[PDB]
Design a protein around this ligand. Structure first.
Ligand SMILES: O=C(O)[C@H]1O[C@@H](Oc2cc3oc(-c4ccccc4)cc(=O)c3c(O)c2O)[C@H](O)[C@@H](O)[C@@H]1O
Ligand SMILES: O=C(O)[C@H]1O[C@@H](Oc2cc3oc(-c4ccccc4)cc(=O)c3c(O)c2O)[C@H](O)[C@@H](O)[C@@H]1O
Ligand SMILES: [Zn+2]
Ligand SMILES: [Zn+2]
Lengths: 334, 306
């Protein structure tokens, strides 16, 4: 049944837009540099990213800003949410803690004025613009070149996959803090950039996927997992069952399967059927066990009972098991 | 090969009470250099293996945007255009560098420590390197593209500068496998670095034995390191470097170096048109002498190692 997967992958591979977003981002960055508080702003990464396989018109860029000397306070033992504490341009923003809401209020404000020179902002992903066909969600992230927080100490378990040498190099790179609530003055750790590095450099062999003898199927199974969820999230668009599931969950599940099957020979493209089945099976195992460790913060359980109700897990579990037992009808359904 | 592992073990014993002082001097030297040389700083060493008291450091200075003019089809020697401007004088630039250094004491060599001045350029590599660094089937094209986005450096040595890629060499050696986990576990221990060490040690011992003849004066550990890199291009797989095969592997390294001596060809690993073993650089008599000495060593289980 694998050739239907390649058929689905063939269609995804094919599905002037990027020119318009590049221009708007260029204008937004330049005027954001005008402000004292957002002076060192630029693109983090390459001004494009499609979190949605199925939505080529839905872009997502991230604006980064370095915070030279911060001290983080772990909010209430969540391991992933922190207060940002510290001649500094950001003291315009509530006590000792840097206010996410105030910093987002000014960020939204400057962009709302900038697009008036038809780009439209949606109602209060800090900002999402509609350029009337293209959506672009802009996120503000704080950059810190200091060493990673202690909660990331046992994460990124890639030593047996991409090597301990690589893991030590990745951890020397900066981490990022993004605003999200609860105590609405918290920032959440973000390692978006590392995952992009890992995916585009995914093999144990440095020449993985650079010749016919070493063609893997890691990227293909990830795309098919994200597509599988995206279709299911849309089939139940109207209802609310799958609103708390994201592509971050399928991507986190994928990296764990990469840790579990580190050799390239376990990802031979001739066996796309079984590997993709194996990844569907792991993601289902996490749904039932209600355990899905954040790949970088192992004590942060993405599938906790306090974040996602077992009702929704049991629902998503039955949808996926029906698809897998029936050659995935949802792939050609829309 | 059990004699090779014996040599390698003795080589490790002579390798830590020394770096603490040279770290203090070098770090302190970079202050009075920042006085005038504002953006100067360390780039990264033991270029000579059997001399653990000699150390080589490199002081790197980024010249912002330069124009490189190739000197006389050398493809490796360049004139740098945009104080010491006459073209940038390496003579006068080293004069002000040696002046300050020798002053704060109270190129330039200070337990011996030889400090080199290098210019950094964050621009694209010169066109003479376009077909060099052929690591594509060994370390991958991704790694090649990433390494060529690193800066290149120019060093002083009829008033020119020479391209320097020693920083790329150090990275490739310490991240040397097609596998990313090569030499990180018992199932993947290779012998590349051991072969390079033995190649370097063999030549330095021969240079010491025949120092009164001056036949080997024009030979360096750089040619040994250059030939070793071509051999890794010839044998890109880690299974051709199994530590159980250190005997055959070392014999393969010696054999290629000999073939470069006999045919008098040894391309710079980054500048393929720069022939290190050319007639205008090393007399054929010296090549045949070094060839004869190495062959006698190889035929008699290397009597220069004990
Ligand atoms: O993969 C994605 O979809 C996006 O993931 C973003 O990072 C996180 C997103 C996340 O999204 C969710 C999430 C989002 C929507 C619905 C349910 C859950 C939960 C997380 O715990 C979560 C997280 O811990 C992250 O670090 C990145 O900042 C972003 O760049 C990336 O595109
Ligand atoms: O490996 C080493 O020993 C040294 O290698 C230096 O690079 C070169 C050295 C070189 O040394 C020689 C050389 C040295 C001594 C005797 C005969 C020849 C010739 C070269 O063409 C040459 C070269 O083209 C280099 O690029 C590096 O710039 C230097 O940092 C390093 O110490
Ligand atoms: Zn691959
Ligand atoms: Zn190795």
């Amino acid at each position: 049944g694998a050739s239907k997967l390649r058929a689905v992958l063939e269609k995804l591979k094919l599905s002037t837009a990027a020119g318009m977003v590049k221009g708007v981002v260029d204008h937004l960055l330049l005027r954001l540099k005008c402000d004292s508080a957002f002076r060192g702003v630029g693109l983090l990464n390459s001004y494009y990213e499609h979190v949605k396989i199925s939505a080529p018109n839905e872009f997502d860029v991230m604006f980064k800003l370095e915070v030279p000397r911060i001290q983080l306070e772990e909010y209430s033992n969540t391991r992933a949410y922190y207060f940002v504490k510290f001649e500094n341009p950001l003291s315009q923003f509530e006590g000792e803690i840097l206010s996410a809401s105030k910093m987002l209020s000014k960020f939204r404000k400057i962009i709302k004025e900038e697009i008036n020179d038809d780009v439209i902002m949606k109602r209060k992903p800090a900002v999402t613009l509609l350029i009337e066909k293209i959506s672009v969600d802009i996120t503000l992230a704080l950059e810190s070149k200091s060493s990673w927080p202690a909660s990331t100490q046992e994460g990124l378990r890639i030593q047996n996959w991409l090597s301990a040498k690589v893991r030590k190099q990745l951890r020397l790179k900066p981490f990022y803090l993004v605003p999200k609530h609860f105590q609405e003055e918290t920032w959440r750790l973000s390692f978006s950039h590392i995952e992009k590095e890992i995916l585009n450099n995914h093999g144990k062999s440095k020449t993985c996927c650079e010749n016919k003898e070493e063609k893997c199927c890691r990227k293909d199974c990830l795309k098919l997992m994200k597509y599988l969820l995206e279709q299911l999230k849309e089939r139940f668009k109207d209802k609310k069952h799958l609103d708390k599931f994201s592509s971050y969950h399928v991507k986190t599940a994928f990296f764990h399967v990469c840790t579990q099957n580190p050799q390239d020979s376990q990802w031979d493209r001739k066996d796309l059927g079984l590997c993709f089945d194996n990844c569907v099976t792991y993601f289902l195992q996490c749904l039932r066990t209600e355990k899905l460790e954040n790949y970088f913060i192992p004590e942060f359980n993405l599938f906790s009972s306090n974040l996602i109700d077992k009702r929704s897990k049991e629902f998503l579990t039955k949808q996926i098991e029906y698809e897998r037992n029936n050659e995935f009808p949802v792939f050609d359904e829309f």
